[PDB]
Amino acid sequence: SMEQVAMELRLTELTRLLRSVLDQLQDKDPARIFAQPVSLKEVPDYLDHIKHPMDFATMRKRLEAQGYKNLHEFEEDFDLIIDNCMKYNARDTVFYRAAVRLRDQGGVVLRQARREVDSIG
Numbered sequence: 859s860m861e862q863v864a865m866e867l868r869l870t871e872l873t874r875l876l877r878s879v880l881d882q883l884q885d886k887d888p889a890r891i892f893a894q895p896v897s898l899k900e901v902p903d904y905l906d907h908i909k910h911p912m913d914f915a916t917m918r919k920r921l922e923a924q925g926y927k928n929l930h931e932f933e934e935d936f937d938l939i940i941d942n943c944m945k946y947n948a949r950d951t952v953f954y955r956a957a958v959r960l961r962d963q964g965g966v967v968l969r970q971a972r973r974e975v976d977s978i979g
Contacts, residue, residue: 872975873924876932879971880921883936884914886963891956892939896946907946912938929975933968940964 887893895913896904904911917935926932940957947953 868979869924869927871978872926872928873921875971875974875978876921876926876929879932879967880914880917882967883960883964886960886967887914887956889952889956891953892943892960904946908942910938910942912942914939929972936964936968 884893892914894915895911896908898904912935917932917939920926920935921932926935940961943953943957947957
């Protein structure tokens with residue numbers, strides 16, 4: 859149908875907007891602490907602690923499969939990255955501190971993305 863195509867054009871454009879959002883969020887992690895999954899070879903007990911691991915490469919795979927329906931789902935994944943880190947790592951670690959800084963700096967980007975997604979529809 860012509861509607862299914864219109865729908866698909868919106869998703870594609872949402873994917874386009876979220877790709878730019880993801881790039882902006884990932885620039886706020888210059889140390890690449892959150893770039894890839896926590897290694898289960900290097901942290902073999904990780905899943906006893908964190909039940910839903912997340913990282914920026916995993917979000918990117920989902921993004922490029924147009925697997926995000928709306929900004930809320932995307933934010934859910936971003937929030938996992940931060941919250942998992944703040945639980946696994948103690949307050950006085952470079953990892954926890956990195957997550958706090960990503961949360962704080964990401965807020966600005968996510969604030970404007972929500973306005974853009976509502977605005978453009």
